[PDB]
Write a protein that binds this ligand. Sequence first.
Ligand code: CL
Ligand code: CL
Lengths: 31, 31, 31, 31
Amino acid sequence: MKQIEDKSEEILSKLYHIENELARIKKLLGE
Amino acid sequence: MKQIEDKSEEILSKLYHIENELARIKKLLGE
Amino acid sequence: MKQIEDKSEEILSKLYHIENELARIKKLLGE
Amino acid sequence: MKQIEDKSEEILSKLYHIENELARIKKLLGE
Ligand SMILES: [Cl-]
Ligand SMILES: [Cl-]
């Protein structure tokens, strides 16, 4: 489905947002 | 194809839940 | 595919592991 | 079906990356 496509794209996209939040927390605590 | 898509929706829901958890953690950390 | 099935199951499974790690961090910082 | 599966593998890889980030965060937090 192009339905699974779109959901797969959002999923990736939140996953990069989560990795960035964690990277940010890691940076901040390292200071 | 439908169990897969049902699965994707489920996966996205858990990401939202992880985002709520990170929202709380960020507040606790003074960030 | 029963291939997408298995990957979908592991994906969920790491997602519950991540939610539990974060829950744990949230608990610990709340103390 | 193959782009979806290629997608799943990608998604799992990002979860592993989030787990490495949480491993580091946990060490920083004294946990
Ligand atoms: Cl959805
Ligand atoms: Cl894989």
